[PDB]
C-alpha cells in the first residue's frame, strides 16, 4: 500500500472513523485518523487558501487555512518526516465526494522543495491557472481541468453543480527528492487556493494536499470519507 | 524527426559541415549549422559556466560562456521561439565524443521557466549535485552520474579518463509549458557549469543545452559532430 | 541632473514635445522624448499589468502592457544599459497629473535583479499590497498608500476621485547593484499592476517604471507631461 | 535598548555569563544568555555554513551549522517571534573578538522573508560576494569587505591575521516587514557561510545572525563575549 503524508481539509465529520463532530483540518500520517486536528470555520462558497510547510531541522509539519476577512485555522504536528516518507516522492492534491457532495475546485497551486548537502538542490512550480491536458500533472480518477483554467478534482456538471460518489487527484509530474544521507537541511512549502461550493446542507468530503511514494495511485475503496488516499480506515 | 533549439559549446571544428576553423559557441535552430556563432577561448581543464536566456517580448536568444579570470564569449540570435518550438517541451543537456574525446562533466544545472496569461505560471529546478539514479532526470545514451555527484554526459573510465565514440543526454523529467495562446510574456533562463578535460591535442566534440519536443530521443547517427541532437548535417 | 531610464505608460499625447497623437507606451533613455514608442489601447477603468525586462547579454530593454481579454502592447529598444546607468541605482514608479487627471493606482509591484561574476548576487522584492508607511519604500511628492493597501502615486480624494496638478513617486529603499566590472551577465525584471480611472474625456498624464541614480528626486518643473522624471523636455 | 533575536555561533565559553564549557551554537532571545544551546564541533580553518529558519504557524526557530564531511549541529527553540520583535526589523550578521581572536569572515549570505495576508509580500537577497562599499549593507564598527569579495566582520591584517579587541556588524539596508495584523503566515530563512581561522589555542568570540529593530546599533560595552549585540550580560 502507498505511504501517505497529508493535510486534510475535511468538510464532513465521520465520527464512525475518528473525525470530530465538526468540519476540521487535520494532519494525517499514514492513516485517515489524523494525528492532529483543528476546528475549521468552513466558508462554503468563498475562496479559501491553504499553506503547508515543513523543515527537517524544526521537524514540525504545519498547515493554515484562511478566507478573506475571517479567522484562520492552524494545525501542527511534531514529526520527523524523513522517517516516514521515502527519499523520492510525488506531491499531489486529492478530493472526494460521497453521498454528500461539493465542488473541489483548485484555483492555484504552488510548491517549493529544497535539499541541501554549496548549494541547495531545489524544485519549485506554480500554477495560477491550469491548461486543459496539463502535461506536467498526472490526473487520477475523476480529476480534470475546466474551461476557466481551474482544477476540478471531483466531477462537476455543465453549469458547475457538484456530483456525488466522485474521487480525483492531481500529482506533479516530476518526483521530488525530499531527503538524502548527510543532508544538512531539507524543507518544503505548498500553497493552494480552493473554492468549495455546495447545494447540500452538509458538504462532503474534502480536499487534501499529500506527499506519497512516486508511483502512488487511488486505492480501491478509498472514496468518500477516505479522501482518495487510504484503502482502509485503520 | 525532433524539433531542436540548442546552444552548442562546440569544442571541435568540423569545417566539412559549417563549423568555423576554431572552437566556438553557437545557436542552433533546427539544424547543426548554427544560425549564429562566436569564437570560444576554450580553457581545457578549467571549470566553465554557461548562461542562456530568452523572453518572448524581446525575442532574442542569448548565451554567454565564461571561466574564472578570463574573457567571456557571447552569442545572440533574433528569433521568435514560439514559432519554432511546440508549447510543451523538455529541456536537456547533451554531449558527444567521436574519434577525438574529452570529459563532458556537468557540475551544476539550473533552469527557470515562466509563462504569464494574476499571476505567472512557472517551473524552476536546480542541481548543485546529482544523485545516482536521479528520478527527476531522463538519462539517454551513455549519460550517467558519477560518485562525486557530477553528471558525466559521455563515457569516462574508473580514473576519470574520457572515452571516444560516446553520446549522452540528460532531460528534466517534467515537460515545461513555454507558450500559450494569449500569453502576455513567456521567458526562460538556464545555467550550467561544466568541466572539459582532455589528453588529446584537439578535444571533441562538445556540450549543448537544448529544448525539444517532450518525447525527444537520441537520433540514429547523431554521434560525434552532430552532438546527439540531429539525425543529419542539413 | 538625475540619470533616468524609464518605461512610460503615457496616457496623454503632448505632440508639442514629441508624443505621438495617441496614448502610447515608450522607452525613455535620459529624455522624455522616447527612443521607442508603441500605440496603447488604453482601457480606462480596467486593471492593467506592465512587465519590463532586460539582460546584459541580449542588451534589449522590453516592455509589455496588457489587460484581461485584450491585445497586448509591446515596445523594445536595443540599448547597453550599463553604458547609461551607474552601477548602483534605485528603481521606482512615478506618475503625474496636470490640467487633465486620472488615478495612478499601483495594486502590486515586483522586481528581480541578478548580477553574476559561483553564484549570482541578487535582489528580489514583491508587494501585492502596500502597508501604510511602508518602511522599505521612499515616497516622494504626493505619493501615498491608501486604506485598501494600494499605492496612490498621485493625489486622490476621500471617495477616490483623482486630482489634477499632482506628482508622486515610490522607490524601493535598497540600492540595487545592476553592474560590476567583469560581470558575466546582469539582468532585471519588473512587473506592476495599475488601475487608471478618470472622469475626464482625456486622462493624463501617465505612469512610469524607472531606474535612476540612488539619490534621485523629483526635479523642479517635472510635473504633468514630464512624468516626474525630467527637469526639461530636451 | 535594542530588541534582539539572534543565533550565535559562540566559539569561546564564558562560563561566568552562562556559556557551557565548550564551543556551542545558541538561540538568543533578548539576552546573551541563550534560551537554547547545542555543542558545536568547531572546525577552525574550514568553511562552515549556517542555516536559520522560522515560520509563524510552526513558531519554532531553528538553526543548523555544518562543515563538509562532518556531523551537523542543530538547535531549536519554541518561540512566537511576533511577540518579541517589532513588525519592521533589520537583519544582520555580527561578530567580535576580545582578548582571544579569530577571523570572522563571511563568504556568502542570503535571506528570504515572506509575509502573507493573493499573494504573499516578500523580500529576498543573496550575496556570493560583497563589493567594496556595498551600498545595500550598513557596516557598523570594524566591519569591512576585503579584496577577495568576502566580508570581514572583525579587524584583519594585510596578510589576513585576525586582531583582538574588535567588533563589527553588517545589516541589510532595507527594513523587512516580518509581521502584520491578520497576516495568514510569515516566514523567514537565512543562510551564511563563514571561515573562522585562528593562531590561538582558543578562538574568540564568535559570529551571529540577528534580527533587531530597524535603527539598531552597536551598544556601548558589547565587545568580546557580548557579540556586538547586548549592552549587558543579563
Ligand atoms: O459524502 C458523505 C459520506 O457519505 C457516506 O456516508 C454516509 C453519511 N451519511 C449517510 C447516510 C446513509 C448512508 Br447509507 C451513508 Cl453510507 C451515509 C459515505 O459515502 C462516506 O464515505 C462519506 O463520508
Ligand atoms: O571527435 C572528432 C570527430 O571525429 C570524426 O571525424 C574526424 C575528425 N578527424 C578525423 C580523421 C580521420 C577520420 Br576517418 C575521421 Cl572520421 C575524422 C567524427 O567522429 C566526427 O563526428 C567528430 O566530429
Ligand atoms: O494633464 C495634461 C497636460 O496639461 C497641461 O497642458 C495642456 C494640455 N491642454 C491644455 C490646454 C490649455 C492649457 Br493652458 C494647457 Cl497648459 C494644456 C500641462 O499640465 C501638461 O504638462 C500636461 O501634459
Ligand atoms: O576573547 C575572549 C574573552 O576575552 C576576555 O575575557 C577573558 C577571557 N580570558 C581572560 C583572561 C584574563 C582576562 Br583580564 C580576561 Cl578579561 C579574560 C573578554 O574580552 C571577553 O569579553 C571575551 O569573551
Ligand atoms: Ca471526513
Ligand atoms: Ca563541431
Ligand atoms: Ca504625454
Ligand atoms: Ca561566549
Ligand atoms: Mn477528518
Ligand atoms: Mn532554487
Ligand atoms: Mn500551463
Ligand atoms: Mn511558507
Ligand atoms: Mn447537518
Ligand atoms: Mn559548431
Ligand atoms: Mn515561481
Ligand atoms: Mn537529488
Ligand atoms: Mn539570467
Ligand atoms: Mn589541432
Ligand atoms: Mn510620451
Ligand atoms: Mn536569488
Ligand atoms: Mn508590508
Ligand atoms: Mn520576465
Ligand atoms: Mn480628446
Ligand atoms: Mn554563548
Ligand atoms: Mn517573492
Ligand atoms: Mn554587489
Ligand atoms: Mn530553509
Ligand atoms: Mn583552551
Task: Judge whether C91 and C171 are in contact, CB under 8 Å.
Answer: yes
Q: After which residues is chain B broken (C to N over 2.5 A)?
A: 117
Task: Judge whether A200 and A97 are in contact, CB under 8 Å.
Answer: no
Task: Judge whether A8 and A28 are in contact, CB under 8 Å.
Answer: yes
Q: Is A19 annotated as a binding residue?
A: yes
Element at A88 (helix H, strand E): strand A88-96
Q: How far apart are CA C168 and CA A126, in angstroms?
A: 34
Residues of D in contact with A74 (CB under 8 A): 57
Task: Judge whether C25 and C42 are in contact, CB under 8 Å.
Answer: no
DSSP state of A162: B
Calculate Rg over the CA atoms of chain B: 17
Length of chain C: 234
Task: Judge whether D134 and D146 are in contact, CB under 8 Å.
Answer: no
Q: How far apart are CA C76 and CA C54, in angstroms?
A: 10
Element at A95 (helix H, strand E): strand A88-96
Q: Using the structure block, give the residue that is written with the C-alpha cell 465526494.
A: A97
Q: How far apart are CA B155 and CA A11, in angstroms?
A: 55
Residue whose C-alpha is closest to residue B145's, from D67, B136, A89, A179: B136
The CB density around residue D106, as the number of other CB atoms within 10 Å, is 23
Question: Hey, is the C-beta of A129 within 8 angstroms of any chain B C-beta?
Answer: yes
Strand partners, C219: none
Query: Three-state SS across chain C?
Result: CCCEEEEEEECCCCHHHCCCCCCEEEEEECCCCCCEEEECCCCCCCEEEEEEEEECCCCEEEEEEEECCCCCEEEEEECCHHHCCCCEEEEEEEEECCCCCCCCEEEEEEEEEEEECCCCEEEEEEECCCCCCCCCEEEEECCEECCCCCEECCCECCCCCECCCCEEEEEECCCEECCCCCCCEEEEEEEEEEECCCCCCCCCCEEEEEEEECCCCCCCCCCHHHCCCCCCCC
Q: After which residues is chain A broken (C to N over 2.5 A)?
A: 117
The CB density around residue C88, as the number of other CB atoms within 10 Å, is 18
Residue whose C-alpha is closest to residue D227's, from D202, D203, D200, D208: D208
Ligand 4 atom nearest residue D204's Cα = 1
DSSP state of B55: E
Chain-centre distance of CA B201, in angstroms? 23
Q: Is A189 annotated as a binding residue?
A: no
Question: Hey, is the C-beta of D193 within 8 angstroms of any chain A C-beta?
Answer: yes
Distance from CA of B123 to the nearest CA of A (A): 5
Task: Judge whether C128 and C148 are in contact, CB under 8 Å.
Answer: no
Q: Using the structure block, give the residue that is written with the C-alpha cell 500554477.
A: A127
Query: Cell triple for residue B226?
Result: 552532430
Q: How far apart are CA A121 and CA C122, in angstroms?
A: 18
Residue whose C-alpha is closest to residue B168's, from B119, B115, B102, B233: B102
3-state secondary structure of B234: coil
Sign (positive/negative) of CA torsion A194, A197, A201, A203?
negative
Residues of C in contact with A119 (CB under 8 A): 118-119
Alpha-helical (H) ranges within D16-148 are: none
Length of chain B: 234
Q: How far apart are CA A18 and CA A25, in angstroms?
A: 13
B211: left (phi over 0), alpha (psi -120 to 50) or beta: beta
Q: How far apart are CA D26 and CA A64, in angstroms?
A: 29
Complete DSSP assignment for D168-201 = EEEEESS-EE---TT-SEEEEEEEEEEE---SSS
Between chains, do B129 and A117 touch, taking CB under 8 Å as contact?
yes
Q: How far apart are CA B60 and CA C96, in angstroms?
A: 33
The CB density around residue A112, as the number of other CB atoms within 10 Å, is 17
Distance from CA of A218 to the nearest CA of D (A): 30
Q: Using the structure block, give the residue that is written with the C-alpha cell 489524523.
A: A34
Chain-centre distance of CA A128, in angstroms? 17
The CB density around residue B46, as the number of other CB atoms within 10 Å, is 14
Strands D206-213 and C36-39: unpaired
Ligand 1 pocket list (CB less than 6 A): A 12, 14, 97-100, 204-205, 224-225
Task: Judge whether D209 and D7 are in contact, CB under 8 Å.
Answer: yes
Distance D190 CA to ligand 27 centre (A): 7
Element at A24 (helix H, strand E): strand A24-29
Length of chain D: 234
Cβ partners under 8 Å of residue B107, min gap 6: B47, B128, B150, B151, B192, B193, B194, B195
Q: How far apart are CA D231 and CA D228, in angstroms?
A: 8
Q: Using the structure block, give the residue that is written with the C-alpha cell 565524443.
A: B97
Residues of D in contact with C123 (CB under 8 A): 124-125, 136
Query: Cell triple for residue C176?
Result: 540595487
3-state secondary structure of D132: coil
Q: How far apart are CA C132 and CA D145, in angstroms?
A: 35
Task: Judge whether A23 and A10 are in contact, CB under 8 Å.
Answer: yes
Q: After which residues is chain D broken (C to N over 2.5 A)?
A: 117
Between chains, do B126 and A135 touch, taking CB under 8 Å as contact?
no
Residue whose C-alpha is closest to residue B106's, from B70, B143, B73, B69: B143
Q: How far apart are CA D143 and CA A93, in angstroms?
A: 49
Cβ partners under 8 Å of residue D219, min gap 6: D1, D2, D226, D228, D229, D230, D231
Distance from CA of A194 to the nearest CA of B (A): 16
Question: Hey, is the C-beta of B114 within 8 angstroms of any chain A C-beta?
Answer: no
Domains of chain D: 1-234 (2.60.120.200)
Residue whose C-alpha is closest to residue B65's, from B21, B102, B27: B27
Complete DSSP assignment for D67-103 = ETTS--EEEEEE--GGGTS-SEEEEEEEEE--SS---
Residue whose C-alpha is closest to residue C59's, from B74, B80, B183, B209: B74
Query: Cell triple for residue D81?
Result: 517571534
Residue whose C-alpha is closest to residue A10's, from A230, A194, A226: A226
Chains in contact with B, where contact requires at least 3 CB pairs less than 8 Å apart: A, C, D
Task: Judge whether B33 and B233 are in contact, CB under 8 Å.
Answer: yes
Q: How far apart are CA D100 and CA D84, in angstroms?
A: 32
Phi, psi of C226 (to 5 degrees): -95, 0
Q: How far apart are CA A40 and CA A50, in angstroms?
A: 12
Query: Cell triple for residue C171?
Result: 522607490
Cis peptide before B54 (omega within 30 of 0): no
3-state secondary structure of B209: strand
Phi, psi of D220 (to 5 degrees): -50, 135
Q: How far apart are CA B44 and CA C68, in angstroms?
A: 51
Cβ partners under 8 Å of residue A169, min gap 6: A92, A93, A94, A95, A139, A140, A141, A143, A153, A218, A228
Query: Cell triple for residue A92?
Result: 499531489
Query: Three-state SS across A41-85?
Result: CCCCCCEEEEEEEEECCCCEEEEEEEECCCCCEEEEEECCHHHCC
Residue whose C-alpha is closest to residue B5's, from B183, B220, B176: B176
The CB density around residue B53, as the number of other CB atoms within 10 Å, is 22
Task: Judge whether B41 and B71 are in contact, CB under 8 Å.
Answer: yes
Q: Is A51 annotated as a binding residue?
A: no
Element at B193 (helix H, strand E): strand B185-195
Query: Cell triple for residue C96?
Result: 503625474
Chain-centre distance of CA B53, in angstroms? 13
Q: How far apart are CA C232 and CA D59, in angstroms?
A: 54
Task: Judge whether C210 and C91 are in contact, CB under 8 Å.
Answer: yes
Amino acid at each position: 500500500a502507498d505511504t501517505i503524508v497529508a493535510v486534510e481539509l475535511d468538510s464532513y465529520p465521520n465520527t464512525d472513523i475518528g473525525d470530530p463532530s465538526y468540519p476540521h483540518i487535520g494532519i494525517d500520517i499514514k492513516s485517515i485518523r489524523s494525528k492532529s486536528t483543528a476546528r475549521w470555520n468552513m466558508q462554503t462558497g468563498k475562496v479559501g487558501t491553504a499553506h503547508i510547510s515543513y523543515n527537517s531541522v524544526a521537524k514540525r509539519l504545519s498547515a493554515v487555512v484562511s478566507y478573506s476577512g475571517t479567522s484562520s485555522t492552524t494545525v501542527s504536528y511534531d514529526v520527523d518526516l524523513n522517517n516516514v516518507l521515502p527519499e523520492w516522492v510525488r506531491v499531489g492534491l486529492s478530493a472526494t465526494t460521497g453521498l454528500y457532495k461539493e465542488t473541489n475546485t483548485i484555483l492555484s497551486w504552488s510548491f517549493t522543495s529544497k535539499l541541501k548537502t554549496a548549494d541547495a538542490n531545489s524544485l519549485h512550480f506554480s500554477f495560477s491557472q491550469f491548461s486543459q491536458n496539463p502535461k506536467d500533472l498526472i490526473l487520477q480518477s475523476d480529476a480534470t481541468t475546466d474551461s476557466d483554467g481551474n482544477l476540478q478534482l471531483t466531477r462537476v456538471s455543465s453549469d458547475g453543480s457538484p456530483q456525488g460518489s466522485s474521487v480525483g487527484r492531481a500529482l506533479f509530474y516530476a518526483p521530488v527528492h525530499i531527503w538524502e544521507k548527510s543532508a544538512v537541511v531539507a524543507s518544503f512549502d505548498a500553497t493552494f487556493t480552493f473554492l468549495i461550493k455546495s447545494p447540500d446542507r452538509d458538504p462532503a468530503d474534502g480536499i487534501t494536499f499529500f506527499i506519497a511514494n512516486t508511483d502512488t495511485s487511488i486505492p480501491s475503496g478509498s472514496g468518500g470519507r477516505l479522501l482518495g488516499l487510504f484503502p482502509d480506515a485503520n
